[PDB]
Design a protein around this nucleic acid. Structure first.
Ligand SMILES: [K+]
Ligand SMILES: [K+]
Ligand SMILES: [K+]
Ligand SMILES: [K+]
Ligand SMILES: [K+]
Ligand SMILES: [K+]
Ligand SMILES: [Mg+2]
Ligand SMILES: [Mg+2]
Ligand SMILES: [Mg+2]
Ligand SMILES: [Mg+2]
Ligand SMILES: [Mg+2]
Ligand SMILES: [Mg+2]
Ligand SMILES: [Mg+2]
Ligand SMILES: [Mg+2]
Ligand SMILES: [Mg+2]
Ligand SMILES: [Mg+2]
Lengths: 259, 122, 39, 98, 113, 126, 79
RNA sequence: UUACAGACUUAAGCAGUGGAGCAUGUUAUUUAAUUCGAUAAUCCACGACUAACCUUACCAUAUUUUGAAUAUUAUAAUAAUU
RNA sequence: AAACUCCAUAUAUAUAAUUUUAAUUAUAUAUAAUUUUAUAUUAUUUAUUAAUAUAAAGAAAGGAAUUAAGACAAUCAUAAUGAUCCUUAUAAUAUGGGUAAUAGACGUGCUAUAAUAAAAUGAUAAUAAAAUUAUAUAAAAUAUAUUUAAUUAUAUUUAAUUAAUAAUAUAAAACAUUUUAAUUUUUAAUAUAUUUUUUUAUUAUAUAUUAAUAUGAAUUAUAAUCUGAAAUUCGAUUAUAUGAAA
């Protein structure tokens, strides 16, 4: 149920940053080494400068290297605080900020896209999917990098009484028990809606000999009546609410508990 | 063994305290416990410090004829001196002020009767 | 000062020398009292 | 075992001929093993990875429009200037000509 | 301008130190001369050839530089450079293996039961 | 196992529409690799962390199919492969005993070159 | 012990000059096998620090130069 | 300063081991080097996932000098741009 | 923290055209226990109770990981940051040597000091598990040591397999038979037997000896082999000889 549904558990393949299996072990070692090196290279491409006093630091998570039989997809989460033009105007619709220029060389640039260069390094098709996170406390890796690299002036002379206060009012204190029990009630309701659907579809009769071998209950519509994409998916999704967080201060040691 | 070992352990336990200090022996068992566990490192401390005197003053310029040794032990200073200055050394005066239990003096006779610098003159 | 938590860097002037162990010293330091660790 | 050795040797020789195998009835050391061992050079020479990786120094010409900053390099250069100001700089290196 | 090794070689892409550079140089030159060394070894060990040719091959083999010797290649940690306790399944030392393993960097490695 | 089983199920669906009788996925024995990492104490305390890697295996067999259709199956499932899954394919082609038109090593070449060089010819002279 | 069928451990050495001039042969090839030709010639064999002078006799053929140039000093205790 | 309980440990019981040769680590000593590994008095400085070369960190001799990096400024050889 | 969770175990379903065969299996999913009930006895806070035993049901009996603080240790040759010092040298390369030296001492192992225990032999081949093999695992056969053969070691050759397929690899102890110094407790020559692989009788079968043998395998001589470009300092194996301590 929890591990038999894609929306209720994290696939164990996601526990590893390099998702690969090659019969040729040497090629697997090489691909693993190539993923660490490219990850380091990408970390060096996140710091950009427009002018001497305009340095935009994009905070990037570690890369997720999905190695399939035909291609390699490099997925990473990034956070960027747009401080140069944070207005209510539409001036950003007439120029490409530095972060858009950086993201457009990953795949869009027709002559020197990073994917084609990497496609020769790996000898396979390569795609890069940057995914933008709007808050810095949605990814443990991004959160640690921000503090470590950007909040130094706040904890270099002790943790400021305001800095700590901000790190304690990030999220409203949700009641985990009530949220946990609401989730369990929704699952019971969905489970009891399907059992009722089948019980009714059986009691209504939707070869007596064949009525002892086959298990086909009837039309798919009736079995899944009132179970649609508009009500089932979002209610069963796990790890949807931040309910705990411990930061430590050099070496930043952030831990987030998403339930 | 076990009996003497315990008395030796007690003194060792006392001196373990930070910035602790030595003290005179109290009983006869402590005299033996000191001559077995504390005399050795005291003999070496006096041996490496009198050889420093003999070299930094001059091997010829170091021949004291009146010696006084004071410590919580069986004339350890005299025992060290008799070794550093050879078996033919016979200074005029050698007074050892053993500041502890009276048994230590009897043990000192035993130790110093095994050095040829200290034998009755005929 | 040394015994305090901040005197653990203080350096005092001591000298170390190596001396053999006689038989009586070896014999004495045998057992659960003198030869066994205490921590 | 009762099969005459001459007969079993004729079968071995003919069999070796059909299967393109080396027939050495005497047993003299021929070195054929050396000629058949696989070459391990390519695997050994790739131990440390592919040397033709994109490097930060190549980014200033691949993407002239974008100005990248190397924080590790930048940190080092600031530490060099700091030591020069404290008088703890590096001695001028002797020239071989001298 | 003054490369430390007789022949020009490309640098490894990752962590670099003097020992890694020396080992990497030996690895590249072993590959360039592997066939040559096998051919001389064959001539020197083929009893069908005259002793003079066999001894000539052995002399040529003894005159090759040390960087062409297969037995001088040493597996080192590709992340730290250490040469002890190096696992060949990952080319990492036991300490770097544990750190990478716990970070999820090794493709299928999990903590044992 | 999760992607392995899901992808295996997809292959069976692809084959059915292609007209390929398929059997499986048959689970093969899982391989376990193990590594022990002694920690800093090595004092016989909790001084040896253990690690392991499990290779999950599945076998899908194809029967009574023409080579062209079999190649279409492999091409399609290759195009839509999942992350972290490897695939080995053994093809079996029944043929006739006698066919039409059918179905030098580097070291040896260098040896001949070396034995012709003057440093070797100067001795082979008889 | 090198297999006899492989032959001697032959190393490049300047033997012609030592046979036409009588000069000593200074060498670090301690593994070299003393061939029967060497008999009578004078060798200076490295021991790690110095070059030990040694003349080869007929009872030294087959051995190796390193065997006659000891590399360590005899042990002694401060009794 | 009182009392209580529980510890960890203790000894008890059982089954192995305690000297010999060799293997291996340490110490001391030696050595051109025997790479490195310990000093506030009980005891106690231990790296077996492989030291012939390599490893290597030590010794002797010889040899190299912007060296493996990044940048600056020149010079060229080369390809594009213009 | 515990619960929970996973592993193990029992069971169910699914998968395998049961020649990749181990279906007595493989691995996905699910279930099960932190067991349950009656009865008698002894205690109790005596009740809707614990400790006990008795009976009944059950395959059910074992593990794993897990909080934050506080006080303290390690150079991590297992990663850093600064300061500090070297910059023709405290950086770099090559050849050789050393890390393997040897008075004493200590730790940890190995093999032994013989009969509730060592050595041989056991082919329609007694009986495992877990691993490994593209920087390979190497079958059978033949040749030599070497003898009918086997065994062991190496060479020649390189079958199959890059693997639930072939190979490393016929597990070993066990068990049976034979043998075994000390041991005159033996062996041999005659005779003898209703113990016959054996009994008995008479003769010889050494003395030495608190002791080291047909126990033990250190040390050492000689010859050959394996890896490697190279085995001298300083590697591994085999044969003949040597046979220390205990
Ligand atoms: K050697
Ligand atoms: K079967
Ligand atoms: K060495
Ligand atoms: K025995
Ligand atoms: K077996
Ligand atoms: K040797
Ligand atoms: Mg090696
Ligand atoms: Mg060395
Ligand atoms: Mg060297
Ligand atoms: Mg050592
Ligand atoms: Mg069998
Ligand atoms: Mg065979
Ligand atoms: Mg058998
Ligand atoms: Mg047996
Ligand atoms: Mg004896
Ligand atoms: Mg024997």
């Amino acid at each position: 149920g929890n591990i038999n549904n894609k929306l209720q558990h994290l696939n164990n393949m996601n526990n590893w940053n390099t998702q690969i299996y090659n019969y040729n072990k040497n090629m697997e070692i090489m691909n693993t080494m190539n993923d660490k090196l490219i990850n380091k290279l990408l970390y060096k491409m996140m710091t950009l400068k427009l002018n001497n006093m305009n340095i935009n630091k994009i905070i990037m998570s570690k890369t997720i290297n999905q190695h399939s039989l035909n291609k390699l997809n490099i997925k990473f989460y990034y956070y960027n605080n747009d401080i140069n033009n944070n207005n209510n105007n539409n001036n950003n619709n007439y120029y490409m900020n530095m972060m858009n220029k950086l993201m457009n060389i990953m795949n869009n640039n027709m002559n020197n896209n990073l994917c084609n260069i990497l496609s020769y390094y790996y000898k396979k098709k390569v795609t890069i999917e940057p995914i933008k996170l709007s808050y810095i406390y949605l990814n443990s890796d991004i959160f640690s990098k921000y503090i470590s690299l950007n909040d130094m002036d706040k904890y270099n002379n002790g943790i400021l009484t305001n800095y700590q206060r901000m790190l304690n009012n990030i999220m409203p204190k949700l009641n985990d028990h009530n949220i946990s029990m609401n989730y369990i009630n929704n699952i019971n309701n969905i489970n009891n809606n399907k059992y009722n659907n089948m019980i009714n579809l059986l009691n209504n009769n939707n070869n007596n000999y064949n009525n002892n071998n086959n298990n086909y209950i009837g039309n798919i519509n009736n079995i899944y009546n009132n179970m649609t994409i508009d009500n089932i998916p979002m209610d069963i999704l796990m790890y949807k609410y931040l309910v705990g967080w411990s930061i430590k201060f050099y070496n930043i040691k952030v831990k987030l508990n998403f339930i | 063994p076990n009996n003497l070992r315990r008395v030796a352990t007690n003194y060792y336990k006392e001196i373990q305290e930070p910035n602790s200090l030595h003290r005179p022996c109290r009983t006869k068992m402590e005299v033996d416990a000191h001559i077995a566990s504390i005399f050795l490192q005291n003999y070496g401390s006096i041996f490496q410090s009198l050889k420093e005197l003999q070299k930094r003053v001059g091997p010829d310029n170091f021949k004291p004829q009146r010696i006084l040794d004071v410590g919580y032990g069986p004339a350890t200073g005299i025992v060290a001196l008799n070794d550093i200055l050879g078996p033919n050394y016979r200074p005029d005066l050698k007074d050892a002020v053993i500041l502890g239990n009276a048994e230590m003096q009897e043990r000192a006779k035993i130790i110093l009767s095994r050095q040829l610098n200290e034998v009755v003159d005929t | 000062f040394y015994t305090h938590k901040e005197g653990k860097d203080l350096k005092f002037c001591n000298f170390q020398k190596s001396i053999k162990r006689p038989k009586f010293s070896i014999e004495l330091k045998k057992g659960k009292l003198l030869a066994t660790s205490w921590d | 075992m009762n099969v005459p050795k001459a007969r079993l040797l004729k079968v071995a020789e003919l069999s070796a001929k059909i299967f393109d195998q080396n027939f050495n009835p005497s047993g003299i050391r021929t070195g054929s093993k050396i000629l058949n061992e696989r070459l391990k050079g390519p695997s050994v020479a790739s131990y440390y990875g592919n040397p033709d990786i994109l490097k930060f120094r190549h980014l200033k010409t691949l993407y002239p429009d974008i100005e990248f900053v190397d924080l590790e390099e930048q940190y080092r250069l600031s530490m060099v200037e700091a030591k020069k100001r404290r008088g703890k700089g590096a001695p001028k290196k002797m020239k071989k000509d001298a | 301008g003054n490369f430390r090794f007789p022949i020009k070689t490309k640098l490894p892409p990752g962590f670099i130190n003097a020992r890694i550079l020396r080992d990497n140089f030996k690895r590249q030159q072993f590959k360039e001369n592997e066939i040559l060394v096998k051919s001389l070894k064959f001539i020197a060990r083929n009893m069908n050839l005259p002793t003079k040719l066999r001894l000539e091959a052995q002399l040529k083999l003894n005159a090759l530089p040390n960087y062409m010797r297969s037995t001088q290649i040493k597996n080192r940690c590709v992340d730290s450079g250490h040469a002890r306790f190096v696992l060949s399944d990952f080319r990492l030392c036991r300490y770097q293996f544990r750190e990478n393993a716990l970070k999820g960097n090794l493709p299928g490695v999990k903590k044992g039961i | 196992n999760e992607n392995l089983d899901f992808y295996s199920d997809f292959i069976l669906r692809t084959g059915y529409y292609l007209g390929i009788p398929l059997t499986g996925p048959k689970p093969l024995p899982t391989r376990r690799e193990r590594w022990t990492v002694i920690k800093s104490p090595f004092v016989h305390a909790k001084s040896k962390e253990n690690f392991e890697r499990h290779t999950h295996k599945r076998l899908i067999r194809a029967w009574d199919t023409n080579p062209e259709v079999l190649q279409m199956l492999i091409a399609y499932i290759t195009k839509h492969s999942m992350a972290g899954v490897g695939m080995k394919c053994n093809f079996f082609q029944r043929s006739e005993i006698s066919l039409d038109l059918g179905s030098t090593s580097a070291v040896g070449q260098k040896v001949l070159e070396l034995l012709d060089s003057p440093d070797f010819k100067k001795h082979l002279e008889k | 012990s090198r297999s006899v069928w492989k032959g001697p451990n032959i190393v490049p050495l300047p033997i012609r000059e030592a046979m036409t001039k009588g000069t000593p042969i200074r060498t670090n090839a301690r593994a070299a096998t003393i061939l029967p030709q060497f008999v009578g010639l004078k060798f200076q064999i490295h021991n790690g620090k110095e070059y030990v002078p040694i003349e080869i006799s007929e009872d030294m053929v087959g051995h190796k130069l390193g065997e006659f140039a000891p590399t360590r000093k005899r042990f002694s205790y401060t009794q």
